[PDB]
Amino acid sequence: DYYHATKTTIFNALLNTIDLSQLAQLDLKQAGEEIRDIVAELVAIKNVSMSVAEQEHLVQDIINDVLGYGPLEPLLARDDIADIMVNGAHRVFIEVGGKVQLTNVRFRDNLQLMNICQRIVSQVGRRVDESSPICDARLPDGSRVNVIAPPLALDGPTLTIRKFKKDKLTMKNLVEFASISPEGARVLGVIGACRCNLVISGGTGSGKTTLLNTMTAFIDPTERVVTCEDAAELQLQQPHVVRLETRPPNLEGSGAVTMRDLVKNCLRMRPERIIVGEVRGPEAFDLLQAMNTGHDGSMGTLHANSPREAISRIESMITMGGYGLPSKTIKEMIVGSVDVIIQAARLRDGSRRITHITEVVGLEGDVIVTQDLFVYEITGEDEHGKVVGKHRSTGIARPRFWDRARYYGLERELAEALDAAE
Amino acid sequence: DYYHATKTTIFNALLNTIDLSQLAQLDLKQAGEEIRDIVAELVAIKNVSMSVAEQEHLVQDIINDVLGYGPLEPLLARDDIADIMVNGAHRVFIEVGGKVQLTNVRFRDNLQLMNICQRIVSQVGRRVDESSPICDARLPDGSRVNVIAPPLALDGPTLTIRKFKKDKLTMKNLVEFASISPEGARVLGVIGACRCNLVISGGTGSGKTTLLNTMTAFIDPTERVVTCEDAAELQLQQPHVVRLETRPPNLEGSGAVTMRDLVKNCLRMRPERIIVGEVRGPEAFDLLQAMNTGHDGSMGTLHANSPREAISRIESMITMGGYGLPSKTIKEMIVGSVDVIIQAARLRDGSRRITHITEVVGLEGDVIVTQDLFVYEITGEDEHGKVVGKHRSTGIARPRFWDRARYYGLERELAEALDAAE
Amino acid sequence: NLVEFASISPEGARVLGVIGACRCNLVISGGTGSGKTTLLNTMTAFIDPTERVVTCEDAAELQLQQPHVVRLETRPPNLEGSGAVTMRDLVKNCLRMRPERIIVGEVRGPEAFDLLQAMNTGHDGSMGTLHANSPREAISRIESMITMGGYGLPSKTIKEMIVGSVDVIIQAARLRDGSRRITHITEVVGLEGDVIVTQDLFVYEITGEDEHGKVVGKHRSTGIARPRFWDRARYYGLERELAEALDAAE
Numbered sequence A, B: 001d002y003y004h005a006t007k008t009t010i011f012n013a014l015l016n017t018i019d020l021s022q023l024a025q026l027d028l029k030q031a032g033e034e035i036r037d038i039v040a041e042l043v044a045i046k047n048v049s050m051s052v053a054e055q056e057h058l059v060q061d062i063i064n065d066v067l068g069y070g071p072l073e074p075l076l077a078r079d080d081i082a083d084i085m086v087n088g089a090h091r092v093f094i095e096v097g098g099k100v101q102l103t104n105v106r107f108r109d110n111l112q113l114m115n116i117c118q119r120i121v122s123q124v125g126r127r128v129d130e131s132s133p134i135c136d137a138r139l140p141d142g143s144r145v146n147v148i149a150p151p152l153a154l155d156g157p158t159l160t161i162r163k164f165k166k167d168k169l170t171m172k173n174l175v176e177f178a179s180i181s182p183e184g185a186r187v188l189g190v191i192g193a194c195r196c197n198l199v200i201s202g203g204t205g206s207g208k209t210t211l212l213n214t215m216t217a218f219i220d221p222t223e224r225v226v227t228c229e230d231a232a233e234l235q236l237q238q239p240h241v242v243r244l245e246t247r248p249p250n251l252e253g254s255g256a257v258t259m260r261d262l263v264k265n266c267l268r269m270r271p272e273r274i275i276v277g278e279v280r281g282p283e284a285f286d287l288l289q290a291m292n293t294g295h296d297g298s299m300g301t302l303h304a305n306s307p308r309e310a311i312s313r314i315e316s317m318i319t320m321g322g323y324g325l326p327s328k329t330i331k332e333m334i335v336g337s338v339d340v341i342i343q344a345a346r347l348r349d350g351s352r353r354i355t356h357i358t359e360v361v362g363l364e365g366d367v368i369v370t371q372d373l374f375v376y377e378i379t380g381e382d383e384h385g386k387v388v389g390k391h392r393s394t395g396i397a398r399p400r401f402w403d404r405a406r407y408y409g410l411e412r413e414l415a416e417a418l419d420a421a422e
Numbered sequence C: 001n002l003v004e005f006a007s008i009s010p011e012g013a014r015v016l017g018v019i020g021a022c023r024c025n026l027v028i029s030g031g032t033g034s035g036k037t038t039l040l041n042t043m044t045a046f047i048d049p050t051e052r053v054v055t056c057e058d059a060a061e062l063q064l065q066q067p068h069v070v071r072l073e074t075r076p077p078n079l080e081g082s083g084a085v086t087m088r089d090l091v092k093n094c095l096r097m098r099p100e101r102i103i104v105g106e107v108r109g110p111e112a113f114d115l116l117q118a119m120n121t122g123h124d125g126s127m128g129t130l131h132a133n134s135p136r137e138a139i140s141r142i143e144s145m146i147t148m149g150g151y152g153l154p155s156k157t158i159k160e161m162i163v164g165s166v167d168v169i170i171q172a173a174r175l176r177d178g179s180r181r182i183t184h185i186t187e188v189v190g191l192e193g194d195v196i197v198t199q200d201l202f203v204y205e206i207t208g209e210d211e212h213g214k215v216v217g218k219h220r221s222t223g224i225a226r227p228r229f230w231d232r233a234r235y236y237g238l239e240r241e242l243a244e245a246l247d248a249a250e
């Protein structure tokens, strides 16, 4: 259509007609209004039979390309979308109703896509380029974006976006999805109420954050919880909750406040619980402190595929913190601090389930001893292809945290659930 | 030679007529359009007897030396040659028909060759010199260039070009070469379509990558595929494929993006199948994770002579990377993740055979149990062939992956091929 | 010349030729001055001329006869501690030059690991020189070097890798009277636990000294009918020579 040619011609000229440094210092509406005059002037020269609505659409497209996120803006806005995949300048896919399908949109050039990705990542403050070719981030709106640079992606820089979900799941939803048997839900309720230190371990996309949210839903409302995340993904209904959020290095690369700083400050604002949005770095150390140095009941979420692996990664993180503690000391601290290690994993069929509810019970010489209260045994593959399994207790009638249950009167509930779940 | 002598005489005058640095000052991508006239106009400026037929060849050679890649040009241009290899200004070998062969072509001097290689690599943007004698790059043409500088290669500058084979063997070709019997071909087809996890073991140059490509040929077009190759070798026809390639560490030991660093990201961009060009280290772990963390149907390739060798080697690779997982856990992960292992070997006769198609069923005593389905049996040795060509199905009705085959509706072909294998 | 100096019996020479042609991952071992470099050069003289061989030598010593050899030499940290192209980097690059055999001049440290990978990952027929007094001591040194590489490799993993990659070890020693002899031709046979089991196809046995003080000894075979690498010989049709040599040794 003549509209596309007119837009291309106007763009090829307005670049040298409007100074970028002037619009760069204005909000989206201000920049669009300023560029409206430039678009009108361009239309005046070599004018075409374009309607006012066509001019407005062209101005919106110019704003999206120069300042927005290019041909994605029409799609990103749409709510029907679940995921957006690009994997090349000339191809873009969308997930609708659980089915991926091609789209009619595309970028002018893979360099346009590259700079669009750079803009999107910069919105979080990270950098993607030939020296830093891979960038994963979670946007403030909550959607996740992963981009990879040409030096690795032979087909040009590749981009993927997964849009933030409006509604979170609750323990009832997990029970109905069979991610955890109802007795497992009861035991989780006991563990959450009884202020047992929690490390929800899992793998990528394995539902860790959802478990953390559902568990924190069990906290006594009176307690002063201090959420601490890299992004605003936790929603707590408790009345007294303080939500923090780290800030990464920006521009020159200063003003950053890492998770460790936030936790170390949390220690000095008398929080009943600390709920770390995710543990990746030395903060684990400062988190493990205040799991036992008061603030009992703090929770964290961690990326590991097995409770043994989770403990190993905690030890590795603490060691990398530079505190130079002996490995024996680190193991002792872990044993003394961590009480429960829930593990959420995704199975072959794609469903997500809580494979282990492990409980750290002691340190034997060199190895931490872990006794599992709930374990998920996979029977096999159903007729329909969906993996099928059953949760079962280990028969423990008095887990380590039993004492804490006695503190809150939940001893009977725990005893009932433990034996009834087998 | 008369032609070479005349060309050298003409070039001696041309270099003065058009300064050597003059072309560099001009746009090298289009400066040749000028020098071509200089040689064309008043051809034989030295008044050297020649003919138009030979004059055209002389002018083309002069242009190639001045602008092109000199004597290397036909080699690159010709399609018959897969690999070019230069050990110095004197000796240059090519690869054709699967065999190496010396060639009559040679360069005038080491400085000429060094300039040629510097130009060829710089076209990608990298630089090779005494400061950085080593150099590795991938050209836009789909080729890999490795260059070593004289300060290291005592014989002189060393160069190796590995071109991307345009035509990969189709499955019909493999059937024709008796590599796999038609029943084996159908079993492979069902396995590929049935979204079974593959590990294509093979011997040195036993055709692993070609087998992997012909296997990918079976993927449903709608499924997202994220190809992660050490070196671009695969060629997929699916509409929705994504190609990734690692980067070796710079000579300073920086900028490296190892395989695991790629597959870990592959986990995060919603793939349907992850395909690893060659699993050769701790990256295997991550792949196996993605093998069972959903994404079922991923296919990686490994170097080994027997399926048992391949699986033991995979355990070894997993235990690297400092992950420190128990061997029992590694075996459990492997049995739960991998489904089918295919072993292909190059026989003494010079041909290649898909020697094994086997299935993993479990440990049954901490020793992974491999149940072969298709075996290549050598009834004996031909006096001059030493090859028989017998592919036999072990029977074994209802292989472990039978249920998935039924789910996808390929049960008919699986039964028809596994049975009536001969 | 080596046969003339009785350093190896003709049967030993034939077995060595079999190993060289049969693409067995060799590791020449021997004390300093044992001529191990000379032995390595002679062994390379047996490689098939078509095969492409890349020579990564810390200092130029080898002189191959084949027509398709690429010679490489390391660099010291000339640039004030920088610019050091260590042997390990050279081998890592050689892995990307599609060579048939990688002939390391001498293995002194981390470069061993990658070399082993070369043997395990396609480049069969690779060779190398190691400074050692006994084949077992040589294997221990190789494991130690791999560990020194800094890779977080459990000792069991390194032992298994050595088992699966190496195929032959040749021991060359300078004897008391200043002569050179080849003492052992062993073949790593597997990891049967926490220790690497080893076979010995060819051995040298001393008996005493002559009237002039010269040590007296002779070579013999262990009678192993089929060495581990026997299958490789089948690949290149070297069964007959291997059997004949291992049988005629005694």
Ligand SMILES: Nc1ncnc2c1ncn2[C@@H]1O[C@H](COP(=O)(O)OP(=O)(O)OP(=O)(O)O)[C@@H](O)[C@H]1O
Residues within 6 Å of the ligand: A165, A169, A174, A177, A179, A202, A203, A204, A205, A206, A207, A208, A209, A210, A211, A303, A352, A353
């Ligand atoms: N048990 C479950 N059943 C069904 N859907 C689930 C279940 N658990 C999680 N989900 C869905 O899967 C996604 C879970 O993502 P979640 O935020 O938990 O990931 P994460 O572990 O925080 O991720 P990452 O490790 O990549 O940062 C959401 O879409 C959630 O709706």
Ligand SMILES: Nc1ncnc2c1ncn2[C@@H]1O[C@H](COP(=O)(O)OP(=O)(O)O)[C@@H](O)[C@H]1O
Residues within 6 Å of the ligand: B165, B169, B174, B177, B179, B204, B205, B206, B207, B208, B209, B210, B211, B233, B351, B352, B353
């Ligand atoms: N089954 C086969 N029969 C005949 N030739 C084959 C077969 N498989 C591979 N080849 C040839 O061997 C060459 C190497 O194959 P490829 O798999 O790319 O390397 P590698 O064997 O090292 O993985 C290819 O160019 C191909 O033509």
Ligand SMILES: Nc1ncnc2c1ncn2[C@@H]1O[C@H](COP(=O)(O)OP(=O)(O)O)[C@@H](O)[C@H]1O
Residues within 6 Å of the ligand: C002, C005, C007, C030, C031, C032, C033, C034, C035, C036, C037, C038, C039, C179, C180, C181
């Ligand atoms: N079998 C042998 N008999 C006699 N002299 C030998 C023998 N092997 C090596 N030499 C002599 O030893 C010298 C150095 O040996 P060399 O290969 O440098 O050992 P290394 O590599 O351990 O230093 C050579 O110059 C050679 O003349």
Ligand SMILES: [Mg+2]
Residues within 6 Å of the ligand: A208, A209, A278
């Ligand atoms: Mg999360």
Ligand SMILES: [Mg+2]
Residues within 6 Å of the ligand: B208, B209, B210, B233
């Ligand atoms: Mg290959």
Ligand SMILES: [Mg+2]
Residues within 6 Å of the ligand: C033, C036, C037
């Ligand atoms: Mg020496």
